[PDB]
Structure 1
């Protein structure tokens, strides 16, 4: 039992924080105002190491474990206000780079993986459908086996990075009779006949992180573009959501650390009634709640990632971390706004935008109600 970072871990965090502050955060307000996702900046960040994660040196990575990857992303969330860009990068890493690395064939990794790792190609993961969100293994898209490969049809929605992606990791039923065990995963390229990527659909939360729908009309998928084995798509999707929960969520821990620093500074500076507003217990009690949340959920995340790195069963720990971080990020966003009063309603300060950016953390990679179903199953309450 130990709560210090190794020198190696500290260096990873500090180097990422410096990049996030000095490269990504510079000029972020202009990009955020204009709803710009800078693909040139995105590619620099990817190549710096944010698209690497556990990927081996053979494909351009540094073979980080889950805790190291989480530290890097925590630093990114603390260091850069441009959380839409950070979310876009972490989605590419966790839902696309990592499943290709972990399950792709030698031939598929050789063709595509280093390009994803260095950010030469942007990827999007397409699983959700209009009738399959929480009930994801009810997806209706079909990849019907044929000579040479598969015929793919269906519609995917809410796809992060679809308007900017070069390749798509897509999940579809190769055996529509089944649920989880009837799903396969495939890699398809932008431009393939029958792939119709929709125009970006605007949103107020994560507003510069583009998403859209994609429609498959009789796409031919060559056999070699299946990722992993036939019918293993459910297991692949599952494994990628573990990395998305476990490591992508670190982004919101680092955002909460930055939020707490800003809020503490204001509560010491702002005077009313002849003293700093932090001297009133109504004010200081809320800030203490923010601090208690940050310390608790960061330890939960660190232990979940550490257990993964030890080869222990970390599924319940990662669901617990994702649930706590996202709830705490939203509640603390509200508490920061309440500390600032009327001065919160100020687009240069970013507190309201911060709350908007935290709202979807309770939804993606599985809603918090679904995390509770996962935890309930691990506790033996779904027997």
Structure 2
């Protein structure tokens, strides 16, 4: 039992935090106010290492483990206010890079992987539909077999990164299968953006497949395998977003601490008033607890143990605590909280899709209950 970062882990965390502070956060205020997703900074961040995860050195990755990745994304969440860019990165990593690295052929990997890992190509994820967003077994997207490939038809909505994406990872009925599709392929129609607020500057839209021919080699994994591949994605997504929010929570705490040590009222800093002080103590309690839960899930995974219930516990706890502390912060700032430059109300806006992405909290409760022997 040891509760310090190894020197390697501190190095990973501190380098990533410097990058997020000095490169991404510099003009984050402006890009955010103007709802700009900077592909320039996005690619700088991807090439720095935020798109690597566990991908091996052979494809330009750093062969990081789960705890290592979580530490990078935690630094990212703490150091950069541009959380929409951070979310785009995490999605590209978990929904495309990691599935391709773990389940794709050597041909698919040699053609696409290193470009995704090093940020030459941006990727988007598409498995959610009106009735098929949750139940990703009943889906109105179908890829019928044909000579030397497939014919894909359907409509995927809420596609993170599609307005900027070069490739798309599509899940389609065949069993479900996973396909990589290049932007521009005939019959692939990317649609325009509907205004966003919850992680505002992170682009999303809907894509339409109208008799798209998918080459045989662009299938990821075996036929019918999509459901497992996708499942793997969500685990990683669950972890990375958990890391991101732990980082944001850390940022939120330091900010609130500043506002409390400086703001003078009644002849003393308002942090001596037990209302604000109690909210800060709550933030600190929440952050330390769910930080430890997250590290233990990641570390168990890196040990080869099965970490899926631990990560479910992590996502549950961080979802809840992040929302509650965001409320506490709005209460603590008062009439200075709606400062778009302070970016707190938008912080909570961006934290809204936490229970709206890789499982509501009821799904996590089901995972935990099953692990406990309750069904």
For residues 83-104 of structure 1, the C-alpha deviation after alignment (integer angstroms, 9 at most, x for no partner) is: 0001101110011100000000
Structure 1 residues 379 and 137, CA, compared in 2 at 3 Å: closer, same or farther? farther
Q: TM-score, normalised by structure 1?
A: 0.96
- Alignment check: 8 A CA contact 1:194 1:219 kept: yes
Helix, strand or coil at the partner of 2:358? coil
Q: TM-score, normalised by structure 2?
A: 0.98
For residues 76-131 of structure 1, the C-alpha deviation after alignment (integer angstroms, 9 at most, x for no partner) is: 01000000001101110011100000000000000000000011000011111111
Match of 2:321 in 1: 328
- Alignment check: 8 A CA contact 1:50 1:73 kept: yes
The two structures, once aligned, show a CA RMSD in angstroms of 1.0
Distance 2:162 2:360 in 1: 21
Match of 2:161 in 1: 161
TM-fit CA distance, 1:269: 1.6
Match of 1:304 in 2: 297
Distance 1:88 1:129 in 2: 19
- Alignment check: 8 A CA contact 1:260 1:287 kept: yes
Match of 2:93 in 1: 93
Distance 2:370 2:135 in 1: 16
TM-fit CA distance, 1:330: 1.2
Which deviates more, 293-302 or 136-145? 136-145
TM-fit CA distance, 1:381: 2.6
Distance 2:371 2:194 in 1: 37
Distance 1:106 1:246 in 2: 26
Q: Which runs of structure 1 show a deviation greater than 4 angstroms over 4 or more consecutive aligned residues?
A: none
Distance 2:190 2:363 in 1: 28
Helix, strand or coil at the partner of 1:42? helix
TM-fit CA distance, 1:332: 0.6
Match of 1:349 in 2: 342
- Alignment check: 8 A CA contact 1:134 1:367 kept: no
Distance 1:193 1:78 in 2: 41
Distance 1:106 1:156 in 2: 28
TM-fit CA distance, 1:222: 1.1
Question: Which 5+ residue runs of structure 2 have no aligned equivalent?
Answer: none
Helix, strand or coil at the partner of 1:87? helix
Distance 1:24 1:119 in 2: 15
Match of 1:223 in 2: 216
Match of 1:178 in 2: none
Helix, strand or coil at the partner of 2:137? helix
TM-fit CA distance, 1:350: 1.1
For residues 245-267 of structure 1, the C-alpha deviation after alignment (integer angstroms, 9 at most, x for no partner) is: 01232011000001000101111
TM-fit CA distance, 1:380: 2.7
TM-fit CA distance, 1:194: 1.3
Q: How many residues align?
A: 375
TM-fit CA distance, 1:135: 1.8
Helix, strand or coil at the partner of 1:138? coil
TM-fit CA distance, 1:348: 1.2
Which deviates more, 337-346 or 130-139? 130-139
Which deviates more, 281-290 or 183-192? 281-290
Distance 2:147 2:369 in 1: 43
TM-fit CA distance, 1:349: 0.9
TM-fit CA distance, 1:71: 0.1
Distance 1:249 1:197 in 2: 29
- Alignment check: 8 A CA contact 1:163 1:199 kept: yes
For residues 308-357 of structure 1, the C-alpha deviation after alignment (integer angstroms, 9 at most, x for no partner) is: 11111111111111111111111111111111111112111111111111
TM-fit CA distance, 1:152: 0.8
For residues 203-247 of structure 1, the C-alpha deviation after alignment (integer angstroms, 9 at most, x for no partner) is: 111110000111111111111110001111000000011110012
- Alignment check: 8 A CA contact 1:66 1:247 kept: no
Distance 1:239 1:328 in 2: 25
Which deviates more, 92-101 or 200-209? 200-209
Match of 1:15 in 2: 15
Helix, strand or coil at the partner of 1:92? helix
Which deviates more, 368-377 or 293-302? 368-377
- Alignment check: 8 A CA contact 1:134 1:370 kept: no
Distance 2:22 2:214 in 1: 42
